[PDB]
Design a binder for this molecule. Structure first.
Ligand SMILES: *C/C=C(C)/C=C/C=C(C)/C=C/C1=C(C)CCCC1(C)C
Ligand SMILES: *C/C=C(C)/C=C/C=C(C)/C=C/C1=C(C)CCCC1(C)C
Ligand SMILES: *C/C=C(C)/C=C/C=C(C)/C=C/C1=C(C)CCCC1(C)C
Lengths: 222, 222, 222
């Protein structure tokens, strides 16, 4: 509690935990294989985030990087490495995407997160932003595929449309927060940055899942 | 050989190596695609464990963690990260599990191992057990799915029943050994802990594989 | 630019980048799901390599290992961990390989790279070569499967034959370069070793992809 941002890490942990438990209870008794995939994917997402928010709260998921002793929460990338592709899989399964398109998405996502991590830990200040730029190019490619790389059922199309729009908006904020926060230019304090990421993460995982798991799009059509 | 536990790391290495070679020879000439998956999965398991037991023997897979300079063999988690999901896949393929259920299993398993590793390396003593608890919750979820989340063929059902029972028993010992050994309360010396893990690992990988690969459950039914 | 090998890391970065962009443009408008998989796989390969060549150029992907202060470019293994299995998947998809065989290949490849990395970072000089030997055994197993573990269409068979022959030749050079270069016996300077790896990598990723993506083997047969 010596670090001002502890409050948002604590709240983040609690909200991911509760979301995980909610999705877990909700998924009880589901027999439809299609719906099972969506529950499995959607429940794992906040469960993973829970563990990484906890690691940050307890101080395990924090390291000091010298550029310009900067506190970098590296645990976010461990979280994102797994949760972002899973979120993309939810969208991909919804629309019955070709395997080729899933691979494209998952691979671009690995690059986005991997280069983001490299940027986060880079000791030469100017180079951090080179990695930011490549990571953003990978994000833009993902956004492109989501709008132009590909829903047959009307309920599938409408849910996909919503979750896709939710994704483009929230995901796009991440590079901006990084850029202006402690990993980037340092204009916004780590405390506020942590709050922004918490709001983003919770919306993109728990908000996302609520929207998805309450839709009948997740069941094969009697 | 300056570390008393070297003998069990040496034996572990030899037993995983021989098991790998046995499974490799045995799988020669197998043409049935189903049986091929089982051999591939079951042979990779001890092959991976071989490499990580070797890394521990030679001292690469050991680090010192300050809490309470504690010797932590981190290589176990590198091994388990890959071998535990593969073992779960063997069981899952056997019963023709839905993809949703496989994802649930694999994901819960990643969490179990990942939080186990975080626990192993955590520098605040009390917090190590928080991570132990979350990892155990993930294990219990796996055990639950194995008994209640789902075999049609009688030979499939019987083999599955055996391998499942083998799994519940041996896997459950792992958290207990951790808790009382050098990663946890330090009641049992690293030397004995290493022996216990060796016996467990060899039974859960080589014993498991022997049981599976001698069964006709692994072939599609003339 | 203080390190003589910077020139080859710079060229490597440029060539992977251009190859990525070429494959990206070329894959535009492709609707055939089969062809989509090949483009996705084949474009991701140099894209990944691009990022890791960049990391090496900027000095992030380099560490000092004490044996015999040896400069080890660890980023190569981060690259190879993902790009080698993807290259094997290209070959595997081409021939419609059984899932069992894909798993065998991917798993053996993970072992090859993982033990290679362990070897690269090992502090006891003699032991480095133990890891080299195990990694090579895994490579030889891959080479075996590629020739004896399994093409129906004549265009599929011919393209596969070429890409397979390209693979056996180039991949086999890697262990030799390691052995004689800075990770191994230190007979050939890091500068020359980096050049050799650059030529190899570019041929095995961009040369490979050119050959594959210009073939009609990648489309399902009007
Ligand atoms: C649950 C977490 C989510 C949905 C996280 C999404 C994160 C991103 C889309 C991050 C993107 C970034 C870049 C595009 C540039 C570099 C910094 C990153 C990693 C924040
Ligand atoms: C071949 C290796 C096997 C089957 C290993 C299984 C290991 C576990 C089930 C470990 C479980 C653990 C917990 C449940 C709590 C924390 C400590 C661990 C990682 C030993
Ligand atoms: C694009 C990169 C490619 C195709 C890299 C292939 C690399 C190898 C086949 C490396 C093999 C190695 C061994 C067999 C022994 C130890 C050293 C390695 C990792 C270079």
């Amino acid at each position: 509690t010596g670090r001002p941002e502890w409050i948002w890490l604590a709240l983040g942990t609690a909200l991911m935990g509760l979301g995980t438990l909610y999705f877990l209870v909700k998924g009880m008794g589901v027999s439809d294989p299609d719906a099972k995939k969506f529950y499995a994917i959607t429940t794992l997402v906040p469960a993973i985030a829970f563990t990484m928010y906890l690691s940050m709260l307890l101080g395990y998921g924090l390291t000091m990087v010298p550029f310009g002793q900067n506190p970098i929460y590296w645990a976010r990338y461990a979280d994102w490495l797994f949760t972002t592709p899973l979120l993309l899989l939810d969208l991909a399964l919804l629309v019955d995407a070709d395997q080729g398109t899933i691979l494209a998405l998952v691979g671009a996502d690995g690059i986005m997160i991997g280069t983001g991590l490299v940027g986060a830990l880079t000791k030469v200040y100017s180079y951090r932003f080179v990695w930011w730029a490549i990571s953003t190019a990978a994000m833009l490619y993902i956004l492109y595929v989501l709008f132009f790389g590909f829903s047959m059922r009307p309920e599938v199309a409408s849910t996909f449309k919503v979750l896709r729009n939710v994704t483009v908006v929230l995901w796009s904020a991440y590079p901006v927060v990084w850029l202006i926060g402690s990993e980037g230019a340092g204009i916004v304090p780590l405390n506020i940055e942590t709050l922004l990421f918490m709001v983003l993460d919770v919306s993109a995982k728990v908000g996302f899942g609520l929207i998805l798991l309450r839709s009948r799009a997740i069941f094969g059509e009697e």
